[PDB]
Tab-separated table of C-alpha atoms and ligand atoms in Angstrom:
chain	number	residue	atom	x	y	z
T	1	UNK	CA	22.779	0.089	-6.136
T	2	UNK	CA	24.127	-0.985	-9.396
T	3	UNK	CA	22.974	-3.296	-12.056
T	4	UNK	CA	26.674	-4.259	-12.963
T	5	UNK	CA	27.536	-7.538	-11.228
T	6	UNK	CA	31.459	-7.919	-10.618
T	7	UNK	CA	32.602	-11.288	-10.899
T	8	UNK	CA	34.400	-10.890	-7.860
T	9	UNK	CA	30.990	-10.493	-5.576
T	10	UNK	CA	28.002	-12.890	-4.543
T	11	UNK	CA	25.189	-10.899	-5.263
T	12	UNK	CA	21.460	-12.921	-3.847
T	13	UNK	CA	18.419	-12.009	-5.684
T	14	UNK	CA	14.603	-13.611	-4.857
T	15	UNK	CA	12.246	-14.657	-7.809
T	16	UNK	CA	8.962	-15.847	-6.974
T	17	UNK	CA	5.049	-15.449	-8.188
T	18	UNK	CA	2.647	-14.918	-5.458
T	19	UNK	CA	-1.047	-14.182	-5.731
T	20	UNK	CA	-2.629	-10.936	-4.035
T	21	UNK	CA	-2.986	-13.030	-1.005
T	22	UNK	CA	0.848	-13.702	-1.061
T	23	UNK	CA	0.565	-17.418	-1.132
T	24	UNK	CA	3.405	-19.379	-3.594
T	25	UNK	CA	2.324	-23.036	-2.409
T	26	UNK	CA	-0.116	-25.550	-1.856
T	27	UNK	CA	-0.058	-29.066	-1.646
T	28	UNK	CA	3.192	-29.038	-3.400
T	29	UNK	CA	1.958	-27.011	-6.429
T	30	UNK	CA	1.592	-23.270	-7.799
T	31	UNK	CA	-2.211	-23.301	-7.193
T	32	UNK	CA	-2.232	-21.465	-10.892
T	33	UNK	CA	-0.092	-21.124	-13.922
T	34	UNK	CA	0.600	-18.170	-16.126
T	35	UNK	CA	2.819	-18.145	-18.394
T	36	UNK	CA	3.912	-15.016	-19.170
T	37	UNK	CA	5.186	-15.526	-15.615
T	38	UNK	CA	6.993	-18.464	-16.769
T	39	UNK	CA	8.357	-16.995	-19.191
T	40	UNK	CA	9.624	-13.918	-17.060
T	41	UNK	CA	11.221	-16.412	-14.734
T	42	UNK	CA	13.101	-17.930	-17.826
T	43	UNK	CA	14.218	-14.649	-19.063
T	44	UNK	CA	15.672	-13.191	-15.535
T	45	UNK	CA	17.550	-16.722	-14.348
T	46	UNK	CA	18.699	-18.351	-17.629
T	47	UNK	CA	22.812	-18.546	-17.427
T	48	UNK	CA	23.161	-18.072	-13.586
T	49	UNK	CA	23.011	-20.591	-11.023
T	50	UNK	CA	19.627	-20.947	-9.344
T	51	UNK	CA	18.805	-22.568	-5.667
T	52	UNK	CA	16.119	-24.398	-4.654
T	53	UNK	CA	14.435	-25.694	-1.340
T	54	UNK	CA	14.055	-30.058	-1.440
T	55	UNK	CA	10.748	-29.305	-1.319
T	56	UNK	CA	10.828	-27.111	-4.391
T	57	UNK	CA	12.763	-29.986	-6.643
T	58	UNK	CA	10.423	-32.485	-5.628
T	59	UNK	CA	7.878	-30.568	-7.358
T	60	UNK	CA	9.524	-30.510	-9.890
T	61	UNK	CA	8.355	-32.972	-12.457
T	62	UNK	CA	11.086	-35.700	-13.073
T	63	UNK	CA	11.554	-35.171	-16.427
T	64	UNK	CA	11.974	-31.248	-16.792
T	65	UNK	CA	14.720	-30.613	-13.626
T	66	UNK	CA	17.605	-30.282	-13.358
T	67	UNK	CA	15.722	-27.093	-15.268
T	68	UNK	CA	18.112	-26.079	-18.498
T	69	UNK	CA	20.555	-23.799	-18.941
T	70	UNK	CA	21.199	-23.110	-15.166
T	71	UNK	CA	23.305	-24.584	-12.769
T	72	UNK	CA	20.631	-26.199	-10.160
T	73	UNK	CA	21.204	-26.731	-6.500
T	74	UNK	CA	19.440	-28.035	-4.222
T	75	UNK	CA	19.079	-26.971	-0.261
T	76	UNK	CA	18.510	-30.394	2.019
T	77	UNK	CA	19.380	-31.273	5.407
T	78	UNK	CA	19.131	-34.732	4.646
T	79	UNK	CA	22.271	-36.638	4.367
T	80	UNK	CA	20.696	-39.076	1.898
T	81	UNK	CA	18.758	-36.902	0.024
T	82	UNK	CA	19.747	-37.210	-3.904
T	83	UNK	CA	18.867	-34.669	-7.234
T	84	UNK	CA	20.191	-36.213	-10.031
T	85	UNK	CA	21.841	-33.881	-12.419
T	86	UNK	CA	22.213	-31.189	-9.718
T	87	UNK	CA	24.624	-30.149	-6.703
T	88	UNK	CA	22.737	-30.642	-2.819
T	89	UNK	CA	24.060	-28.839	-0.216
T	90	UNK	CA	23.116	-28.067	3.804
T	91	UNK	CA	23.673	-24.420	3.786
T	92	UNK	CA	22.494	-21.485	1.807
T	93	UNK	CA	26.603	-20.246	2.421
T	94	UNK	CA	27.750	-23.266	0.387
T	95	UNK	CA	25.431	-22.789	-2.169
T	96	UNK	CA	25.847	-18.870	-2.691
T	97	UNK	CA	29.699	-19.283	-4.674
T	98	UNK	CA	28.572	-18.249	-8.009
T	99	UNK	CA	28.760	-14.483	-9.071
T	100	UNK	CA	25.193	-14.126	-9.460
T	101	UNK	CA	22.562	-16.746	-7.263
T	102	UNK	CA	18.894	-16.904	-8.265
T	103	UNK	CA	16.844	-18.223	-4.886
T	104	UNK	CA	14.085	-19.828	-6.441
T	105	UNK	CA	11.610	-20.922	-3.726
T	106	UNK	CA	10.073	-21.890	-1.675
T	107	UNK	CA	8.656	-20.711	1.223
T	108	UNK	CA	11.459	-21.606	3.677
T	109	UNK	CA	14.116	-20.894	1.281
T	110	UNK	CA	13.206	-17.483	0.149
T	111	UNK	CA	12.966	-16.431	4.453
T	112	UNK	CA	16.060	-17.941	4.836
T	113	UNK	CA	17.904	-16.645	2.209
T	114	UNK	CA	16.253	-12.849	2.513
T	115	UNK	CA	19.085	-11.296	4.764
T	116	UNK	CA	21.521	-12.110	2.119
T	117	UNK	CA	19.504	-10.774	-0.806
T	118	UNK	CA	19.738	-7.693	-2.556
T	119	UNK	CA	17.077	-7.945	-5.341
T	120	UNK	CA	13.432	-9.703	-5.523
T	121	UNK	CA	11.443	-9.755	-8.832
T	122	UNK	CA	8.040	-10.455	-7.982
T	123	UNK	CA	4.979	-12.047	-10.013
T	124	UNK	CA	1.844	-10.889	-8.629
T	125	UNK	CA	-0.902	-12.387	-9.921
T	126	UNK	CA	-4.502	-10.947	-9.179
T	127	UNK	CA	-6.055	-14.576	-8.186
T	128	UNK	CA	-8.573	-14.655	-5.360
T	129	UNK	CA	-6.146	-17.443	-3.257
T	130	UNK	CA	-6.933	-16.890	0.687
T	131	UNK	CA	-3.971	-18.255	2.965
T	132	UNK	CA	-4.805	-22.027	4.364
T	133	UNK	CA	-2.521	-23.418	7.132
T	134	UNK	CA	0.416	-25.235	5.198
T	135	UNK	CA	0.368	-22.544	2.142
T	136	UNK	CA	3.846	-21.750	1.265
T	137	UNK	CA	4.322	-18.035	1.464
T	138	UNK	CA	6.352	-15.081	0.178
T	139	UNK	CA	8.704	-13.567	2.567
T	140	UNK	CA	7.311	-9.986	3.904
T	141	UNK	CA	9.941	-7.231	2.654
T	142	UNK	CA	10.771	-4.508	5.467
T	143	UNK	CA	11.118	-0.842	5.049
T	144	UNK	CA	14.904	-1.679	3.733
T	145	UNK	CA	13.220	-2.849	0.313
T	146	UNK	CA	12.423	-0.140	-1.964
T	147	UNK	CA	10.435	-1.139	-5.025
T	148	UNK	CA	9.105	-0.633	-8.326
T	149	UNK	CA	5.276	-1.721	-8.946
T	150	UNK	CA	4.442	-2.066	-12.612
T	151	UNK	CA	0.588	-1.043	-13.669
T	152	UNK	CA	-1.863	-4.715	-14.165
T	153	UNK	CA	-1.576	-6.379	-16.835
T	154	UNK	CA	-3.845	-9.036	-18.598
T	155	UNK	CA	-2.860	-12.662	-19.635
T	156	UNK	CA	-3.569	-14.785	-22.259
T	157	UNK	CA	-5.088	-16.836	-20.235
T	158	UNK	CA	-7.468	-13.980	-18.115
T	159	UNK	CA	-6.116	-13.723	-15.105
T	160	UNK	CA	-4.479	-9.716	-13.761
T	161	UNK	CA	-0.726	-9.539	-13.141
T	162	UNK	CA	1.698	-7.057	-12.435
T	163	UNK	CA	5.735	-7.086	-11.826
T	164	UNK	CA	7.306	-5.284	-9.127
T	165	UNK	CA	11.191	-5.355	-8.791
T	166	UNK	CA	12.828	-4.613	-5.059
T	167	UNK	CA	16.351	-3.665	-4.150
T	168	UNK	CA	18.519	-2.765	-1.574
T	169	UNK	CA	22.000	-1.783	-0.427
D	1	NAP	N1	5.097	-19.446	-6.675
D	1	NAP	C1	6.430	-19.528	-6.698
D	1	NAP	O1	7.148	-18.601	-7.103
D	1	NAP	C2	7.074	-20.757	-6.121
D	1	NAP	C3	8.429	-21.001	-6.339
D	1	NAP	C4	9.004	-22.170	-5.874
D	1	NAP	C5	8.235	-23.073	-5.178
D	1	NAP	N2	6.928	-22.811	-4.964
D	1	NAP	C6	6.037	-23.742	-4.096
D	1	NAP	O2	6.438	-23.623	-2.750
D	1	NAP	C7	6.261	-24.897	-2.083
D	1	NAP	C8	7.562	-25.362	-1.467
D	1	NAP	O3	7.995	-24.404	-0.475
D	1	NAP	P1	8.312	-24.878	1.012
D	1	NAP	O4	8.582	-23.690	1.852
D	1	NAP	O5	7.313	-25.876	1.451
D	1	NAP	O6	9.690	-25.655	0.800
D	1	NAP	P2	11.101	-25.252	0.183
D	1	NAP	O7	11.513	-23.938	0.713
D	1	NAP	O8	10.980	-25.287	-1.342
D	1	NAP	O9	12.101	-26.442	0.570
D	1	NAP	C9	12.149	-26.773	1.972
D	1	NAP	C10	13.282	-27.720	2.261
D	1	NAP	O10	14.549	-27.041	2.088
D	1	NAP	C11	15.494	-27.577	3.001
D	1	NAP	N3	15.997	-26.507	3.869
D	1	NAP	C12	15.281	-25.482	4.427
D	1	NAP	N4	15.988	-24.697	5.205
D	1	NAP	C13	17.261	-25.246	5.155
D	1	NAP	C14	18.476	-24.881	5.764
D	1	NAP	N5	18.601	-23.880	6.638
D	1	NAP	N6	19.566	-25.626	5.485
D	1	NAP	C15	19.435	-26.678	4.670
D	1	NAP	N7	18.341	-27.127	4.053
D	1	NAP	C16	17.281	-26.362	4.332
D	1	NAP	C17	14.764	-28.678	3.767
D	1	NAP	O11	14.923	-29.923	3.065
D	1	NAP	P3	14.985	-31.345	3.819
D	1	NAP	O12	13.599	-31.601	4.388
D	1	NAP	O13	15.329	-32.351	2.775
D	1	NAP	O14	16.043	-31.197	4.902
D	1	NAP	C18	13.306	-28.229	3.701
D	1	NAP	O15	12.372	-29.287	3.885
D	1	NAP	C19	5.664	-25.840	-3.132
D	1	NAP	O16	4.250	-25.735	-3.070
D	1	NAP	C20	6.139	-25.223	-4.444
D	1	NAP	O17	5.241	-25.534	-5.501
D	1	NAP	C21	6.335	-21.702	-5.435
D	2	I6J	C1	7.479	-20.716	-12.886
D	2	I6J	C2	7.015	-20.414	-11.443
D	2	I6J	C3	7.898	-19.370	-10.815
D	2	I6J	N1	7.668	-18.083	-11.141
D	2	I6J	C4	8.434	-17.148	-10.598
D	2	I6J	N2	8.190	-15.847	-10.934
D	2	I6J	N3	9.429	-17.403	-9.735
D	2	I6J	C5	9.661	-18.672	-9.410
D	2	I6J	N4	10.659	-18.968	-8.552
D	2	I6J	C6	8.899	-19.715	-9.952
D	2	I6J	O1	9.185	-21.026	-9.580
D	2	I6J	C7	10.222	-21.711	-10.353
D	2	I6J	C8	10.247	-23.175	-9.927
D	2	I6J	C9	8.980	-23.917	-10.365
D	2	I6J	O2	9.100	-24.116	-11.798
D	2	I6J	C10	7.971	-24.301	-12.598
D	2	I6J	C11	6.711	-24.331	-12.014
D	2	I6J	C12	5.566	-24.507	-12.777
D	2	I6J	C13	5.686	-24.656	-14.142
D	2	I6J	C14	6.946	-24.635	-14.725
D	2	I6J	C15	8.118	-24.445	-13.993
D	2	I6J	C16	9.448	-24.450	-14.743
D	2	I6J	C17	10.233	-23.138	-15.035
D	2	I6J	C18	11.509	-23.460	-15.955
D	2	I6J	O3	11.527	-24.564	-16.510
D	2	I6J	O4	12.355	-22.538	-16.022
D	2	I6J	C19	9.417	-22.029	-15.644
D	2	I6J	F1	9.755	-21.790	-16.977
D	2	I6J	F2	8.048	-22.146	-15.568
């Protein structure tokens, strides 16, 4: 791999925070917040175009999205569905046009747009969350992925984290 991007290519990466359980979503929330991790998010998708599931602008408070400094679409399959401020699309191959695509969530999204994807930055935070039916979940990476698993960290707010960055070909 490279970390040059071409502006010529499509290159698909994954961000998403996940506790040790690997659940992203409940009841259309994070179940936590940490911001170092939003802060991480800010730093790696700032200037690029980032795409979100419906589900993932609706939670979205009204006020903050279309988020800043980002070009925001939004994945629906519902004809009338509207996001003010932001581009909605039916397909993850209409929304993947821009050099360099940030898949933001959720659950459905980030297994949908996997096969395309050749980086995930992971938050993993060290919450005791067990799966319920509904959670939204991280996608499962097969042996393709390799990765890099930073050592724990502490937050201001006392909760374990770590990084890990995947890529492949
Ligand atoms: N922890 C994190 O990193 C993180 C990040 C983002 C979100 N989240 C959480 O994850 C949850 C949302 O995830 P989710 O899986 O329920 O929903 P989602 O992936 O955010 O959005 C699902 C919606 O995307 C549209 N969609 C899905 N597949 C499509 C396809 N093939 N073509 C076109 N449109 C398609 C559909 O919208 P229509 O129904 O309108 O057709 C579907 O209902 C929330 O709890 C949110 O807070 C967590
Ligand atoms: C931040 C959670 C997250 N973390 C990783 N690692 N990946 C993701 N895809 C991810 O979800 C992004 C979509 C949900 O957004 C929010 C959720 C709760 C609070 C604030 C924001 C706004 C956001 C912004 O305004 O940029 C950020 F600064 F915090």
């Amino acid at each position: 791999s490279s970390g040059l991007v071409p502006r010529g290519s499509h290159m698909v990466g994954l961000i998403w925070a996940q506790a040790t359980s690997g659940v992203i979503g409940r009841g259309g929330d994070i179940p936590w917040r940490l911001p170092e991790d939003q802060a991480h998010f800010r730093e790696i998708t700032m200037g690029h175009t980032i795409v979100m599931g419906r589900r993932t602008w609706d939670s979205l408070p009204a006020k903050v999205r279309p988020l800043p400094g980002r070009r925001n679409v939004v994945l629906s399959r519902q004809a009338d569905f509207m996001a003010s401020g932001a581009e909605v699309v039916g397909s993850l191959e209409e929304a993947l046009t821009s050099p360099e695509t940030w898949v933001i969530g959720g659950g459905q999204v980030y297994a949908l747009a996997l096969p395309y994807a050749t980086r995930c930055e992971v938050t993993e935070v060290d919450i005791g969350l067990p799966r319920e039916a509904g959670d939204a979940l991280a996608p499962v990476l097969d042996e393709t992925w390799r990765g890099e698993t930073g050592e724990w960290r502490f937050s201001r707010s006392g909760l374990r984290y770590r990084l890990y960055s995947y890529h492949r070909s």
